Every structure is written in C-alpha cells, then in structure tokens.
Structure 1
C-alpha cells in the first residue's frame, strides 16, 4: 500500500524481497525516468534534503555529494575517492520536506550519482532498463526503513557466543600459533570466545580440507579449544583449487557445478591456491552441493564460518595471464623505448579483478545461460545463501555464526557482514561507525570492522580506541593482515588496559544481545542515526559521529589520536556513563545541548537516554560465564527495561519466558 513496485524490461529475480508486491500501474511518483541511454532515474533535491542508505558504501551517513557504484569489488584501500566497495545495497531514502525510499532491484553495475555532478541532482542509472524499482512511503525516514525491513525478511540471527570477542590474524598456522593465543588471553584474564582460522589452516588452501600434518586429529584440537570456551571460526574462500584427486574439484567438474566459459569449459580464475574454479552460485543444485560441504567441518565441532574473496575476487584468469606474460615479452625486447615501464606496470594491475574476466564466464540458472557481469553482484549473496540453506538442513534448530564479505540485499537473511580490508588509520574508526546504521537499514545487523585496522601498522592507542567502538558492534574481532605489527591484546604494555575495554564488552553483552534479538525479531534497527530518533531536531539530524543503540543509549566514541575527549550534541538530557578501568562506573547527568566530554584511553563511554535504563553484568571471561541473575541497573530511577534472553543456541524465539521486565 505504502509500497509500490515499478517494473522495467524483464528483471532478473534476485530473490531480494521475501514479500510479494504487485506491479503498480500509475505514473512513477517522483523525478523522471529515461531510456535514451540504458536506464536512468533523475531527481532534483531540496537544498535541505538528506539522503540515507547504500548500506556498505563509502563516505558518510548522508550520502549527498559523491558518486557510489554498486559493483562488488575486492579493493584493500578504502580511501575517500573509491566509488565501489564490497557490498551492493541499492536502497536509498530521500529525507526532508519530500521524503521517500527507493530500492533498485538490479543485479549489475548501478551508478548512484548523488549530487557529485550537479549538487541538487540525484541520478541513479544502469546499462539496462531491466530492473524493478520499489517506491516506499511513510511519515519519516525511520518508518520508510521499517517497511523495507519487513518486505526483505527477518535478518540473520547469530548464536549468542558470537556476541563475544574474537581474535584473528592472517598468519595463524599451527596448533602452537593457536595455543599461544589462547595462552595470551586466558592467562592475562582477558575475555574472549573466538579465535578465527585464516587460509593457512587448509591443506594447500583447498576448500574443505585441513592441514593433516598440522592437525593430525583436528576434531580433538577443536574440542581442546572449545573446552576453554574458545570456538575456532574457520574461513572458506569462493575458489575450489584445480587439482586432480581433490574430491571437491572432481565432483564440481563431473557434475558441471562450476561456472563455464562461452564454450562449456570450466573457467579458471587464480586465487590463493593458484588456478581455481568458482561454484555456479546462481544454480540451485550447485548451491546445495557447495553448502553441504560445510558438514565436513561441522561434523568436527565447528560452529561458525566466514566467507571471503567472494566478489568473487580474481588475481588473474588464464586469459589475462597470457596477455601479460605476452606484453612483458615486448617490454623485455623494447629497444626504442616505445614501451614505458609505467604501461607494463599498468597491465599487471589490470589483470586483477578485470572487468573483461567478469564477462568471460557464465551462470546456469534453471537451464538459462546468463553472463556473470550481468549478475555480478549476486555472487557473494548466493554463496552465503548456500551455506545458510545447507545449515538449515543439517540442523534446522541450531544457530551457526556466519558472515560474508561481498553481499547484496537478501543475503542479510543468511549471514552477517564484516567490513573487509580496512587499515590501521584513525579515519577508519569513523568509517566503521558511519557504515553501521546504513547497513541496518538494509537488513545487515550483525556487522563490525577489523578492530585496530586490518592493513598496516597499528599503535597501542589506535587499537584501544578501535576496541572501544567494537564494544558496541555485534561482530567484535581484532583482525590483522600478513606481516603487520602483531596486534593481539597481550602484545603491548600495561595489558590490563585492554582487559578493561574488553571487560566492558562482556558486561554489556546481555543488553546488546537483548537489543539485537528485539531488533531482528521486529524487523527493526539496532543502530540508528540521531535523525531517526529526533526527527524534529535540525541539529541532531546532521550529526554523523554518534549513533543511537536500541532505544536506551547513544554512543559517541573518540576517534582522534592523542585526544582525551570529544564534542557531543545531546538532543535530550542523558546520563553520561564511563566504564572505568578499576571496575567501577562513572555517572553524570548532562543537559541537552553541546558538550565536550573527557574520555581517557582506557575508559568506555556511552549515554543513557532520559527516562531509560540498561542492565549491566559483572565481567566474565566468556559469554557462558556471565551471571545474568543479579545485574546492576544503570540509568534513570523509575524506568524499566524489557530484557530478552534465550539459550542463545537454538531458535526458540517466541516464548513469554524470553522476556522479563526490569525496573531500576
């Protein structure tokens, strides 16, 4: 009713939406649509108009003033200029005097020119007038989003343990590597529930093996780790290594489960294991075959997975590789200097994630051959769907921890997202923050960034400020790239400081989980821009470095080096809370308005809204040990918090026992 679906050409069915919406028949309600060059929507914006959405895209909460292209790209350098990151989330809302939401249900490259060309002009275009546009209406932007959240289906719900802290590093390889990490944390009493395993745990980077030489009995090691409440979260890449004898490879080939070239042969793309093949994620059968392979690890005790390189990322195809070796040929023999080293360098770079490669292989969809570039942004989506759907067969009642890098809307039902290869820059603390709400609008609630920065060298302080933001993000893990400064918490001085920050995560767990469960089950938001909560405050709607969490709190982390505080705007009176390093909790009332607050490196800050309160537990070293019984209530006297909780393992969501009102 307050949602209509306008249809152009013959759209590919993305299965993005779970709710049926009939094809409206009147005139498109806003702006203009054109077909002189492919397809274009053009809209003129009110000078005060704010644009939200685009989920995991570059820049800030208000998208006005730059260009975003949905075109899932493996790009390790997230600088302000980049137009396409990992995600393809074609949902925007124009909010102002004239407010409306738009979802562009489209598989391929979609360019959102949001004021970049002309300031007052919003122009969303793509090569093909074959798509569905969904127009949503409501009073405010929050209401437009909650409607969207309805029609795309309930977001993924992770197991309770995933609301713990997780340690990860590209490099962990042996039982020793892993033990010294468990050692490092448990011996210094720093809580943690997860350690991630990156590609070095496989045999020759073969999907669905383990290095038999390093884990002669992987299952027992898993049980040894799990005994200390450490759950090993293995990675899975998109490419299956080409290698005779390799079971997963032989099957893929024999049953035509792989993407093929225009000639029927299996397309080769090179990744970690060298030459690989990509499972045909768009083909229902291949998807059940791929998903089922997760049993290999589940049967061994594994309760979580992360999907990577699933744009899919291509270092080089056999086609590109020959072009390059060949060019290098003329370079090597160049006497006249007709071939500059810059160009040789340019070719090496162009064979990576080549657009030419993305038209070299095809998907087989219920018998229809479709070229990959045409459906490019669905690949990661469906790889994560394969896992999810396979999960539900293996054990319909159990929750598995699951996240992916690349995604498209609809994938939000089967798994969360991590924000990819960030760097150890202070600006990336803010980027982590700004992306949260957008992702929530698009259904992705279980998200977080690599704390302390994936790439490059971190410092003791960058890490602590990153963690302090992580405290509030459902996914909280410290991750680091190959050969960077070691950034485990125990790899610094005065380690107790890190204990302090993590401790705060582990006291806030029952609240954060609660607020998560309530949001997901209600097709609602976990993180909200201040604009959603105080739509009348023309000051609040412009704030981009503070977020509302649930209905009880606001967060505002420090993201500047050497700072000892930061400016905040409070659209209402709140109590200002800091989790102190001695184990106590500072509390101060602060009137609405502007304020500079003092927040030391080893203190964690949050605000509690007027007439509200939240439960806080004692610090425990793992999710299982948190005493949920006698929690302290912080906030406003006479207020009440409805606390959700369940076994945090199965999907028994609708019990009256799951709710329990607390009054301060």
Structure 2
C-alpha cells in the first residue's frame, strides 16, 4: 500500500517488474491525465522540486529544464541538445514538498517535457494511451527508488573479474594484435583482466563465427590468454549477415526466426556485414535459438560478451537505399535548381535509423504480429534477455559478463550497460558522472563509459580513467606517452576492487543503489541536494573526480566531515581531515581522490596485477579509528549469495 498501478487501454507486456500489482480502480492522485491527443500526463511543479530518474539520458541528475524522448537511438554524437540516447528508462521521481515516483511502463516513444516548454510544468506524453503507470510514494526519493528497485527484481551481477580493467580497440584482428597487448601490460606490469574483441574477429562480421584464417585453434588461443589471466570478451551484433551456407542465417530463414516485412519476407537492414536480418527478439522461440548460439563461444573458453547495434541500428534498408538512389538520379539530372544540395544531403541522413524503416518490419509475439515501432524500445532489452536466459540453461549457477548498448527497464536483471561515443570530450566525464546515480535508480549497476575518439590527449585519458576506477565497468576501448601515470591509476583501481566489489554485492543483494546523489544521503542539506558533480558510493565514501583540462584540483562541498584520501603514484596514501563546508583540493593527473565519511572506514588491498591475485586476506583499513566495515566476499564466480559467511566485520 505505497505502490499503485494505473492501466490505460491494452498495454503491451514488458515483464519489466517481477512483482505483480493489482490495478487501481481509484483516482489518479497527481496532475491531470488527458486523452485528447493520444496520452498526456501534466503536472505543475513547485519552484524547489527536483526531478530524478530517466536512467540513460542527457544532462544532469536534476532533469528539470529540458526535453527527453525515450526512444532507443544509435546516434553517437551526444550534444547537450540531444533528446534521445540508447536508453529508454521511464522512471522519474518528483522531489519537493510533495514527493512521488512514476514509472511509465511503455514500449514506444515516450516524451518527457520536464520544464522545457513552461518552467513549472511537467508533461509526459505518447501517441496511444496503451500503457501502465506505477505510482510509488514514500518518505523521500531514496525510499521511492528503493521500493522500485524491489519490484523490478534483482540487478544483474557480473563475475568478479569484470571488476578488473579491460582494454580493447576496434582494429584488433590477428592473434598478433592480441598477443601484443598481453605483452604490453604484463611486461610493464600494468594490472588488467580483460581484452575486448571488436567486430573484426568474426568471419566477415558473421555472428558466432571466428575468422578461420586468423584463428585456426581458437580454444588453444583462448586458453593461451586465460593462462595469463586475460579473458577475451567478444562482441555480438543485432544483425545476422545474409549469406548462403552461413548456418545461423539458414536456420533463421528456415525456422521463421528473423523479423518479417508486412508481405512475409525477411526484413533486410544493412549493417557492418552488409545485408542482415534481425532476429525476432520478442518471439520467445526465436529468442531461445539466438541465446543458445552463445554456447558456440562459451564452449571455446569464453566467459563474457557484449551486445551492440541492438537499438537496432540501421545504416539503410533495401527500401530506403532504393528511395535515395532515385532522388540522387533526380538530383543528378536537375539543372533548374529545383532539387537542392542540402535536400540531397538530408535524404541521405534520413535513411540512417529512419523512423520509416522501424515501420517496415514486425514481431511475432506469441502469435501476435506487432510492427516494430510499437515496441521499439524493447528490442535490445530482449536481445540481452536472450543471452541471459541461455546462460541459466548452460550453467544456472555461473555468472557471465554481459552488457548491452540498448536497454529498457527489465534488462537490468540480465546485463549491464556501457556508455560510448564517437568523440573524446572533457564534458563527457561530467556527463558520465551524472548518469551514474540515474542508472542505479532504474536498476542498472554494472555500467561504465567510453572515450570514442585520436584527440585523446594524455591528460584526458588520465582523468577519464580516474572516474572509471569507481565505475563497475572500467575499460580503455577505442579506435587505433609517460606510461607510469597510467599504471598508478590502474593500481588505485585494483587496490579498491575488494571494497568496490563488496559495496556492489551488498547493494545488488539488497535492492539498494551503488552510486547515490548527495541529495539521497543528505536530503535536508540544501547545499548537498544541488551538487551534481560528486557522488556517494556505498555508505562509506564520496567521489569527486577532476574534469577540467589544465586543472590542478577542483572545488568540493563536504556535507559532513571527511578524510580527503588520495592514492599517490609511489603507492602511498595521503590522508587529511576536512570539516563540513566548501574546499578547494589539490589533485594531480596521476593522483586518485576520494573522501571517506566521518566514522567510516574502507579496506584497501596492495596493488595486484589481476583480480585472482589480489591479496584480500590482510588488507589495510583506511578511515576513522573505531569504525567498522562489513566486507562481502564469495568465490566471485557462482551464485552462492545468501550465506552469513559471505560477510565479515572489520574494525579500525
């Protein structure tokens, strides 16, 4: 009796929540609901109200003052004005004198006008009034989030090695490229556990193949790598190549597993392999077939995968390619200047990720033909759901590394999310920082981010990693000076793996958040609730990364007394007490900073070069003498979660 479900029309089932809620047959408690123009919820905000949520969305922790459209989009630019990223996360919480959470359970384009049109007005709208709205109430936002976290079911948990460092690069192809990196890191003694394989390892980008000529005994090569504690983490894309004699393709065609055109034919969408077909992720039979395929690589020693282009992205369709050729031909033989160069340009952008192409193909959902656009936001969800179920069939008791580009609430149980770009910008450290608590709100905990890019200067990479240190996914993956600064930073990471791991485990198992906004921890502190460039982690620290070029430090607000801790290259740990108030603090490039809360402590291992070798048996306790910390640890591999003996109390 603090959670209500309001149903309108005939909502498609997303299986986002795992707890059942009775339909409310009373009045919608807040705002106006209107069905004149599709569906709209309109609400007038108090001046001080903060709006939390929307997981993977643009701008800040407080969403007030802009427009967000939930419409999973393969856009990779990410300017302030972008309305849509890769995530459809329709959770929000109004935080003011009146406080409530709303989850709009809806698979299609959802529109969040949060102060955009009129500063005082919140307006959520969509084309058809076929959705469920959950209303969550409580003390405050954190309490609201915590109930929500309880109904959407438990968050995905990676194996412990996923808490190491990873490196990848679009362009790695041959055994020698991967041999070259193991050598780089291991011989310069940079810690690391994972090496990503970008698309090039396949046989002509064909899903679930390895390049036969570059990889003649993959399992022997996989084992080669596993013997130096390097786990090869290969990519899988939404598109299956159209190739005669390609087995996946042939079973896809034969068993009616790909999405279909209205006319009955298998829909074609050009991606990296050229012409592909999309597996029908909403069809549970097609989902099992595709999930199962991952066995092919699991059977060769592979322990982690990443799914990509699953919005799904489309460079162009057959219809659109043809449409645009006809235009071009018309442009080509204009001389009366009737067809303009920017019209010809505009037709060319318009065939990439075209709303019209998302209306040309269909899902067969338990017998029901649905057009993709009606449910577009669930695709990548289900692609990840597919793999996550295949894992439970092969070995229910084993955790695999899995993370996806596209997501919808409900996926949070089957994998994590990675934030990527086609650009390396200082502003993106801040962006990625602010996104963190918001992902946590909607259940996405194993997340990190990328520096697309060759305008990665040394310092950008250094500060970028110094945030990455605290993000559960931490890698250096891009397209392809002073080596020892890079090492000191990965050292800091590995010194922190045990505590970070423990905080994540305690959080995941308790339906609690990993990263929190200062607002959640200090809700009555009117300064704290406005800080967006600092986060609280677990119940013990606060992070405040440096994100400005040329900066020798930054400003901070401490909502309470804390120990300013830093990891110094020499392996030392500088420690200083700072009163509640505002401070400027020195943080050099190669230095890694966090603040530990009054009467808290955290354990700190010596640096180790891979996760299995971290000496967790006798760690140092940094923080305040007298304080306790509960350390969680298990085998890091399997699902033996509810043991008293996974918890140990440490005292300073």
Pairwise TM-score range, normalised by the shorter structure: over 0.9
Give me the whole-angstrom Cα distance separating, in 2, the residues matched to 1:452 and 1:207. 23
Give me the whole-angstrom Cα distance separating, in 1, the residues matched to 2:422 and 2:263. 38
Q: CA deviation at 1:184?
A: 1.0
In 2, are the aligned partners of 1:451 and 1:467 still within 8 Å (CA)? Answer: no
Give me the whole-angstrom Cα distance separating, in 2, the residues matched to 1:330 and 1:36. 41
Counterpart in 1 of 2:147? 147
In 2, are the aligned partners of 1:100 and 1:141 still within 8 Å (CA)? Answer: yes
Q: CA deviation at 1:331?
A: 1.1
Counterpart in 1 of 2:102? 102
Q: CA deviation at 1:587?
A: 0.1
In 2, are the aligned partners of 1:40 and 1:124 still within 8 Å (CA)? Answer: yes
Q: CA deviation at 1:452?
A: 7.3
In 2, are the aligned partners of 1:422 and 1:428 still within 8 Å (CA)? Answer: no
Q: CA deviation at 1:332?
A: 1.1
2:170 paired with 1:182: no
Give me the whole-angstrom Cα distance separating, in 1, the residues matched to 2:374 and 2:125. 15
In 2, are the aligned partners of 1:65 and 1:114 still within 8 Å (CA)? Answer: yes
In 1, are the aligned partners of 2:448 and 2:471 still within 8 Å (CA)? Answer: yes
3-state SS of paired residue (2:596): strand
Pairing 1:33-48 to 2, within 5 Å after superposition: 33-48=33-48
What is the CA RMSD across the aligned residues, in angstroms? 0.7
Q: CA deviation at 1:336?
A: 1.2
- Structure-1-length-normalised TM-score: 0.98
Q: CA deviation at 1:56?
A: 0.2
Give me the whole-angstrom Cα distance separating, in 1, the residues matched to 2:429 and 2:112. 25
Q: CA deviation at 1:179?
A: 1.0
1:104-153 Cα offsets, whole Å, 9 max, x none, are 00000000000000000000000010000000000010000000000000
1:544-601 Cα offsets, whole Å, 9 max, x none, are 0000000000000000000010000000000000000100000000000000000000
In 1, are the aligned partners of 2:421 and 2:451 still within 8 Å (CA)? Answer: no
In 2, are the aligned partners of 1:361 and 1:371 still within 8 Å (CA)? Answer: yes
3-state SS of paired residue (1:642): strand
1:152-196 Cα offsets, whole Å, 9 max, x none, are 000000000000000011111111111111111111110000000
In 2, are the aligned partners of 1:471 and 1:505 still within 8 Å (CA)? Answer: yes
In 2, are the aligned partners of 1:452 and 1:463 still within 8 Å (CA)? Answer: no
In 1, are the aligned partners of 2:222 and 2:301 still within 8 Å (CA)? Answer: yes
Q: CA deviation at 1:524?
A: 0.3
Pairing 1:76-115 to 2, within 5 Å after superposition: 76-115=76-115
1:500-551 Cα offsets, whole Å, 9 max, x none, are 0000000000000000000000000000000000011000000000000000
Give me the whole-angstrom Cα distance separating, in 1, the residues matched to 2:502 and 2:196. 25
3-state SS of paired residue (1:257): coil
- Structure-2-length-normalised TM-score: 0.99
In 2, are the aligned partners of 1:500 and 1:602 still within 8 Å (CA)? Answer: yes
1:414-436 Cα offsets, whole Å, 9 max, x none, are 00000132521000010110000
In 1, are the aligned partners of 2:420 and 2:451 still within 8 Å (CA)? Answer: no
In 2, are the aligned partners of 1:452 and 1:466 still within 8 Å (CA)? Answer: no
Pairing 1:133-144 to 2, within 5 Å after superposition: 133-144=133-144
Consecutive unaligned residues in structure 1, runs of 5 or more:
482-492
Give me the whole-angstrom Cα distance separating, in 1, the residues matched to 2:545 and 2:451. 14
In 2, are the aligned partners of 1:451 and 1:477 still within 8 Å (CA)? Answer: no
Give the one of 532, 556, 559 matched to 1:568. Answer: 556
3-state SS of paired residue (2:253): helix
3-state SS of paired residue (1:643): strand
In 1, are the aligned partners of 2:420 and 2:452 still within 8 Å (CA)? Answer: no
In 1, are the aligned partners of 2:628 and 2:649 still within 8 Å (CA)? Answer: yes
1:182-236 Cα offsets, whole Å, 9 max, x none, are 1111111100000000000000000000000000111111000111000000000
3-state SS of paired residue (1:376): helix
Give me the whole-angstrom Cα distance separating, in 2, the residues matched to 1:435 and 1:563. 23
1:602-629 Cα offsets, whole Å, 9 max, x none, are 0000000001000000000000000001
How many corresponding residue pairs?
Answer: 651
Give me the whole-angstrom Cα distance separating, in 2, the residues matched to 1:5 and 1:216. 55
Give me the whole-angstrom Cα distance separating, in 1, the residues matched to 2:19 and 2:565. 41
Give me the whole-angstrom Cα distance separating, in 1, the residues matched to 2:25 and 2:165. 50
3-state SS of paired residue (2:172): coil
2:129 paired with 1:129: yes
Q: CA deviation at 1:338?
A: 1.6
3-state SS of paired residue (1:451): coil
3-state SS of paired residue (1:63): coil
In 2, are the aligned partners of 1:40 and 1:125 still within 8 Å (CA)? Answer: yes
Give me the whole-angstrom Cα distance separating, in 2, the residues matched to 1:161 and 1:522. 22
In 1, are the aligned partners of 2:417 and 2:446 still within 8 Å (CA)? Answer: yes
1:314-369 Cα offsets, whole Å, 9 max, x none, are 00000000001111101111121221111111111100000000000010000000
Q: CA deviation at 1:450?
A: 1.1
Counterpart in 1 of 2:333? 333
**Change over 3 Å in CA distance of 1:526–1:628 after alignment to 2:** same
In 2, are the aligned partners of 1:452 and 1:467 still within 8 Å (CA)? Answer: no
Counterpart in 1 of 2:595? 607
**Change over 3 Å in CA distance of 1:451–1:659 after alignment to 2:** farther
Consecutive unaligned residues in structure 2, runs of 5 or more:
none
Give me the whole-angstrom Cα distance separating, in 2, the residues matched to 1:373 and 1:409. 18
Q: CA deviation at 1:494?
A: 2.1
3-state SS of paired residue (2:260): coil
In 1, are the aligned partners of 2:56 and 2:86 still within 8 Å (CA)? Answer: yes
Give me the whole-angstrom Cα distance separating, in 2, the residues matched to 1:311 and 1:195. 24
